Design a protein around this ligand. Structure first.
Ligand SMILES: Nc1ncnc2c1ncn2[C@@H]1O[C@H](COP(=O)(O)CP(=O)(O)OP(=O)(O)O)[C@@H](O)[C@H]1O
Ligand SMILES: Nc1ncnc2c1ncn2[C@@H]1O[C@H](COP(=O)(O)CP(=O)(O)OP(=O)(O)O)[C@@H](O)[C@H]1O
Ligand SMILES: CC(C)(CO)[C@@H](O)C(=O)[O-]
Ligand SMILES: [Mg+2]
Ligand SMILES: [Mg+2]
Lengths: 286, 281
């Protein structure tokens, strides 16, 4: 067991160190909670941390690892925001006891060898133009789950397709962990918090409110049916200056091979300049 | 409530959730869970895996019996007899799930093996090892054993499972068990039942070629290869698919040192495989 200081933030980079500490804690009765992140922490991540912290007898592990495998090109990987010092400052302020910060070499000593092949959902929506993105996400999450062996793992609803794919991973591989989805944290005007929001200039920040406005308009319009909901959302997006919609789709909640029937999810992706923003909302039809 | 478990008896569970709960409960009580994955039709080869698991102090042996559709190209079943053999061996847990219980959502998320899966046995069956690693990963997650046992006869399968464990950071020890052989050296295999007399006599060439190579190896890699090739060339009706010397992880064989020699051949409609440790020099 590496040194562990209860009540303080303990940072471990070696997978073996966090694995040993987690096992030891689990053996003494504490329930290990895992919050996987790629760093650049904001209030949305803190909500995941808080959800984890409130589980009785919990010890929280926040992993910070910008996973190369889920980036389609080195350019995107190099562009990903990195603010390590602020991240750890936020974790200490939150009372987090463990941050797991592995190196790329420790996670991929053999490059891409055995990997996770997601189901068909990975080739749609976000996966359409980025066919290997979700295999990258599921492979790293599977590894993080095996290293930490948490009782529960927390993900934000903002990246809803990712959340669904992780539930598929857990069910399909018989993983003994509970997946907890946490509601999206939003700015005062409705904008979904995201590390990519820092790339919106003042005008784009103003126009970006259209995504959340379109989704909530659609959710209330839905009493009149799917067409009314989608058209309300389209009208709001169309009134927004400089917002180029990638997709706007209403799907069954599992996003799978099932038609929309009562409870659904409305998902949107749009570009403001070079920044691609995502958002989604629960929708009840009729 | 945890399902019933009667020590010293053969406890059979078909529900993944059930064997998962019992295994977890037993691990807590001071037992080390050993997993032996099988597809039924048990013979002495499987029994060697079972005995290997039983030897571990404090062991509780879990033998899974599941004909995995995913590893078949897109099979003998003797349930009662298999369970009798396990009972005779002192095995306490048999896990016998249905295809629907293992694949409730069909093939959705699966394991994609590294490039080794496309070589050797992967040539004729390119989706075979994805099927194997997917079901083995699931069995490891359901049973959570301390050690998992596989026969060295399927060496490439053994190596790919070692890759799976390392690559996904699985906390389990993979144990390779030496190949059980008939008196003349033929690796035991359920498929040997298909060989007619002439084919069964010719089939001794695989093991004879490997052992000849292992001993010829003091003279170098080429000598080992040529010796094995000569033995196979002395047998009629043996269509060699491959004869390769690789390092122990199945990469390229080093200048000298340890390695593995693998062979596969077709005798009529039956494909046979075998392999052996080789020390070069
Ligand atoms: N506004 C928000 N509310 C709740 N959870 C959020 C959130 N934004 C992100 N998350 C969650 O935080 C976890 C880590 O995601 P990250 O990609 O590290 C941050 P990000 O805000 O999504 O940056 P990004 O826009 O560059 O992808 C995910 O489970 C994600 O869904
Ligand atoms: N002769 C042998 N010695 C040791 N282990 C063996 C063995 N033959 C098979 N095994 C092991 O038994 C397990 C189950 O493999 P199976 O394919 O189900 C049996 P099989 O005898 O190889 O049948 P087959 O001829 O239909 O391929 C594997 O771990 C395999 O390597
Ligand atoms: C789940 C995750 C931490 C895997 O790297 C990443 O995809 C993210 O930030 O959501
Ligand atoms: Mg994200
Ligand atoms: Mg076999």
């Amino acid at each position: 067991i590496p040194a562990f200081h209860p009540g303080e933030l303990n940072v471990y980079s070696a997978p073996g160190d966090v694995a040993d500490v987690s096992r030891a804690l689990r053996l003494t009765g504490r329930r290990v909670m895992l919050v996987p992140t790629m760093g650049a922490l904001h209030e949305g991540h803190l909500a995941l941390v808080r959800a984890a912290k409130r589980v009785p007898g919990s010890v929280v592990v926040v992993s910070i690892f910008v996973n190369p495998m889920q980036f389609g090109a080195g350019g995107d990987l190099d562009a990903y925001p990195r603010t390590p010092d602020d991240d750890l400052a936020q974790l200490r302020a939150e009372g987090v006891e463990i941050a797991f910060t592995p190196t790329t070499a420790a996670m991929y000593p053999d490059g891409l060898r055995t990997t996770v092949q997601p189901g068909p959902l990975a080739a749609e929506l976000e996966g359409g133009p980025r066919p290997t993105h979700f295999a990258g996400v599921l492979t790293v999450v599977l590894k993080l789950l095996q290293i930490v062996r948490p009782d529960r793992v927390f993900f934000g609803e903002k990246d809803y397709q990712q959340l669904v794919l992780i539930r598929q991973l857990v069910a399909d591989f018989n993983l003994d962990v509970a997946v907890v989805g946490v509601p999206t944290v939003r700015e005062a005007d409705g904008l979904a918090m995201s590390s990519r929001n820092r790339y919106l200039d003042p005008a784009q920040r103003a126009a970006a409110v259209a995504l959340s406005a379109a989704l909530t308009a659609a959710a209330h319009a839905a009493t009149a049916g799917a067409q009314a909901a989608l058209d309300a959302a389209r009208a709001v997006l169309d009134a927004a200056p400089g917002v180029a919609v990638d997709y706007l789709e209403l799907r069954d909640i599992g996003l799978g091979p099932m038609p929309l029937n009562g409870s659904g999810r409305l998902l949107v992706a749009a570009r403001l300049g070079t920044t691609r923003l995502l958002d989604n909302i629960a929708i009840e039809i009729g």
